[PDB]
Structure 1
Amino acid sequence: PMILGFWNVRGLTHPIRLLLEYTDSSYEEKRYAMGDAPDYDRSQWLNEKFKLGLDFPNLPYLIDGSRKITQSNAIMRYLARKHHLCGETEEERIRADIVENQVMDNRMQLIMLCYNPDFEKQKPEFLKTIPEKMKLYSEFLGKRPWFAGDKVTYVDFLAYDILDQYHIFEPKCLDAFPNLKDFLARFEGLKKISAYMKSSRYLSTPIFSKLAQWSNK
């Protein structure tokens, strides 16, 4: 089958695992473990980093026969093309493009905070910024059922993940945004998703590696 490699955390790989399940892909996973502080040993990965034939070795990676991919967005697009889960008109394409990239930004902002030695003192400032990020997603989605238009596309998988993470981080963050709360429930409502969430494979937390200041164990 296809091999997905990543750390044994949700990290930035949730969308992929979700999309592999949604599409009924036949895949196996390799979940590398990181050791504990203070050294946070990475040897399980490092032992094979340069042995897998990857052009730009990194995690996550996807091996699909002779096809070897790295970079999460490139893996997401590869599986989207295979399964017809890309936008179909220019307008959906542009919406898809923007959201892909915007998710990445919002993901990096969370990371910078959670790996900041000053997490606890930085936290208050970060919180204040949340309602503005969510408003932008709320107004972008509006009354559409999904981010790109009328049909699920790979970008709903990225959007779900990041909205779900901010929601774990600040549970009351979606209170003001009905259509967001509704998008979460709709997504989780998809038959394949629903069934995966009850599976042995489901990995929602920790979100971050042991190095982080939040959701690290």
Structure 2
Amino acid sequence: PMILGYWNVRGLAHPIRLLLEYTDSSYEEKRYAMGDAPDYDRSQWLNEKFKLGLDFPNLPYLIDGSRKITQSNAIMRYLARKHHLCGETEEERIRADIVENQVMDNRMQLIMLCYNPDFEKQKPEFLKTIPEKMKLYSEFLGKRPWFAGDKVTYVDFLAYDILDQYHIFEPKCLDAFPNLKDFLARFEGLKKISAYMKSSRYLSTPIFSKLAQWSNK
């Protein structure tokens, strides 16, 4: 099978795990565990980091036969090409490229807030920036079913993840944006996704490691 390797956290592997299920991929995962405070041992990973034949060793990785890939975006693109879930026109490619990169910015922002010792102090200020973030997603989507246009593409897996994560952080953030709420329901309603979400493989939380100040357990 293909092998997906990542920590036993949702983290940034969610979109890949969802895409693996959506495409009926034949895969197995190696979910590495971090030890506890104080050392947060990373040895299960460290002992084989340089022994997998990865060009730039990292997590997540995907082994697919002869192919070995690192960089979550690269894995997502690889699967997208494999299963034809890319933009098909120039307009669709642009929207996808924008979305991919924007999701990563919004991801980092959350991460940066959550790994900050002054979380509680920072939070209030961060919560006020949300509406403006959501409004940009909402206006970009507009009336389309999917972020790139008429067809589900790998970018919808990314958008779903970040919008979902945002919603968990601030449950009311999507109230003024019904098209985003509708997107989340349309995405979760895809058949394989629905099945996966009820399964033993599903890992919706924790989002971060033990180091974080939120969703770290």
TM class by shorter-chain length? over 0.9
What CA distance in whole angstroms lies between the structure 1 residues aligned with 2:71 and 2:115?
A: 21
Partner-residue secondary structure (3-state), 1:50: helix
Match of 1:3 in 2: 3
Residue 38 (structure 1) shift:
1.2
Residue 108 (structure 1) shift:
0.2
Partner-residue secondary structure (3-state), 1:3: strand
Deviations 1:52-111 (A, max 9, x none): 000000000000011000000000000000000000000000000000000000000000
What CA distance in whole angstroms lies between the structure 1 residues aligned with 2:158 and 2:120?
A: 27
What CA distance in whole angstroms lies between the structure 1 residues aligned with 2:67 and 2:40?
A: 31
Deviations 1:36-60 (A, max 9, x none): 1111100000011000000000000
What CA distance in whole angstroms lies between the structure 1 residues aligned with 2:86 and 2:77?
A: 8
Residue 215 (structure 1) shift:
0.1
Provide the TM-score with structure 1 as the length reference: 1.00
Match of 1:61 in 2: 61
What CA distance in whole angstroms lies between the structure 1 residues aligned with 2:142 and 2:122?
A: 31
What CA distance in whole angstroms lies between the structure 2 residues aligned with 1:6 and 1:88?
A: 30
1:147 aligns with 2:151: no
Give the unaligned 5+ runs of structure 1: none
Residue 140 (structure 1) shift:
0.2
Deviations 1:109-142 (A, max 9, x none): 0000000010000001100100000000000000
How high is the sequence identity, in percent, across the aligned residues?
Answer: 99
RMSD: 0.3
Match of 2:16 in 1: 16
Give the unaligned 5+ runs of structure 2: none
What CA distance in whole angstroms lies between the structure 1 residues aligned with 2:39 and 2:120?
A: 23
What CA distance in whole angstroms lies between the structure 2 residues aligned with 1:48 and 1:117?
A: 31
What CA distance in whole angstroms lies between the structure 1 residues aligned with 2:24 and 2:115?
A: 35
